[PDB]
Symmetry: C5
């Protein structure tokens, strides 16, 4: 399913952005 | 159950990006 | 009403990323 | 339609992330 | 179609975010 891939990649993007925020602060 | 999840995740992404912008500013 | 919100949020993300790019310079 | 706008905005997001990576290097 | 291009661009976004995370730490 192509739609599920987008969601499962966006969750990883959210995790990576949280990591970026924590590394920045 | 898919595009609503996408919208929710993108709202989280926008919040995180705004946090990044305000951290880079100071 | 479904993908219109997606486009709106993508637009916000693009603006925020451009702001980050400018602020890094 | 609006789906093509999502792809265009994602192209710009990739470009802006490339700019961020270049500015971090 | 267009959805498969969105998935490819998200994969690129994940890779670039991994690069940013590695650079930060």
């Amino acid at each position: 399913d192509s739609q599920k891939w987008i969601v499962f990649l966006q969750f990883l993007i959210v995790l990576l952005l949280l990591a970026i925020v924590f590394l920045l602060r």
